[model samples]
Target chain A: MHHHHHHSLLTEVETYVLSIVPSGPLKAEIAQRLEDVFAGKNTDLEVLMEWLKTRPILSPLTKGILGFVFTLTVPQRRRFVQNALNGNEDPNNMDKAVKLYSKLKSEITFHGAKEIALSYSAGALASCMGLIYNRMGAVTTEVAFGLVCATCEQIADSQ
Target chain B: HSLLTEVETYVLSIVPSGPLKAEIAQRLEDVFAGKNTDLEVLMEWLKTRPILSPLTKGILGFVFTLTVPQRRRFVQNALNGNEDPNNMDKAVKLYSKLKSEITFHGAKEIALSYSAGALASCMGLIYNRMGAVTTEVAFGLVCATCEQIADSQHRS
Candidate 1:
């Protein structure tokens, strides 16, 4: 059971890496190399850095640092959501939101994926409504908020 | 002690027993009572489950297409039992009619493909109000008929 859980974590890491590294030959190679590393066939840090250097999608240092961090922390969901919604110019908040989004975006669990998708869809709809209807001072935000609550309850019941 | 929306009580009754259900009930209580300032957290947590997001999106799009009175009637029928079979048919027809107003291609396609799932969700609401179980046939008929209905709507 421990190994199964551990293995799933490794798969999630690979999944995260593949998500950022655009689809191409390098992606395929990365998968194979990652499998080799997981299976204990590749352990040389220098060799891994060399391999990553050849890839155009991400810098060796950036990918290496984020990949390590990804395994170590799960972002606090409330903090992430609030930071994202703040939409302020604070560089610290922007950084938090950026990294949080990157981590959350890599989430592959059924619930996690759905939540992210729904949030984006609701945000987009509200934005469109605001652009189209806001000149009359309509309460687009409130309407979308209510719709989201109703939809979320329906989803929870369905689950 | 906080008040709950009528919809919140219904949701609490229908959701399978869990801490999550309780959590949501509390959040809605706060929301309805005008006390919940941080609604984003609740919204974020509720939407994370699979299959239901698109279904929710489809319904969200459908809801926005209705007039205020139409919205009230739809909610009333969904919350209570519509009872009359013909009225349910009219509801379905209206669903198809207003579907075009969504405009966004992604939302529109989701509304079409998962129309059955959305229908089942609403019927579950009605079933709860009527003190009856939502029928398997209700789910099956919608699943089976959705395609045919879409085709007919297209041909017309």
Candidate 2:
């Protein structure tokens, strides 16, 4: 019954989501994101970045979700870290970069972390929209956070 | 040929009837003839209109990025000038700007595509008028590509 309930709820969300978002690559990507999140699998920021790099069209809402997710996962650091994410460096190089990011994260004081996290998240999301869409998509933190929470709840409670 | 005829008429319609209208018509004629011409007046007006959608941007981006390199090369060969410095400079500047401005990988990609597309269009116009490619031919390609993209956006 619980599995059936989850299945039905997923169906509902899928129908709702499809209606709102257009078809093709964008639609497929959204489905993949939802599936990965619901499966309790961590999404690779590198893969997400690559997807962004390759694709031409993207919605602001989609970019917002991507940015929010990426920031939440990052240890946040220098050009070294960015270079790895951008694929300028070798794939293996990311390990060291991630480690360095984590080290910095660990060093930040508790109060400082929250401030840093919010600031970084805002910056990441804004830059993503500006750079990609060239004023095409603008998303707010409140809407991004709320939508994420709403979807998470819908997916989680359905399970 | 037919599409250009249509585009020519429609684009010409954007400029009102007057002596300047006739001037633009001559310019358009030059464009269609694959002869020396400038898009300045037409584009100067067109740029102020149309908030291009993401789909339009993507399609245009693809067109510009895919087409610009060859067009640039053709122009270089014809001009017998080292065009790499200026062209590469612009591309590199935009890419670096992408790197500096955005942190997310996906956003970076989209920005690259969008910016590259716009750049490619400008380059295409410059090269085309210089006889690297037929101006009317490319103008048709753009119109056709935009039509498809616009229709797709509407269907969704």
Q: Which number leads on TM-score?
A: 2
DockQ scores for all predicted structures: 0.01, 0.01
Q: Model 2 misses residue A140 by how many Å?
A: 3.7
lDDT of 2 by residue, A18-126 (tens): 4434578877876776555544465666666555545556544444444444443331212222322233322222223222223222332322322333323322323
For B22-122, candidate 1 gives per-residue lDDT tens digits of 66556555555556353334434444634333333222222222101112233333322322333333333323333333332332333344433344333
Tens-digit lDDT string for candidate 2 (B77-135): 32212223333334333333333332333322433343333334333323322232243
Tell me the TM-score of each prediction against the true structure: 0.23, 0.25
Candidate 1, residues A1-159, lDDT tens digits: the string is: 121224555565456445545477877877876666655552665545445445566543234332332222211111122222232323233223223233332354534533543443323322222211211121222222232332233333333
The residue pairs that clash in candidate 2, if any, are A49-B105, A52-B106, A53-B109, A132-B111
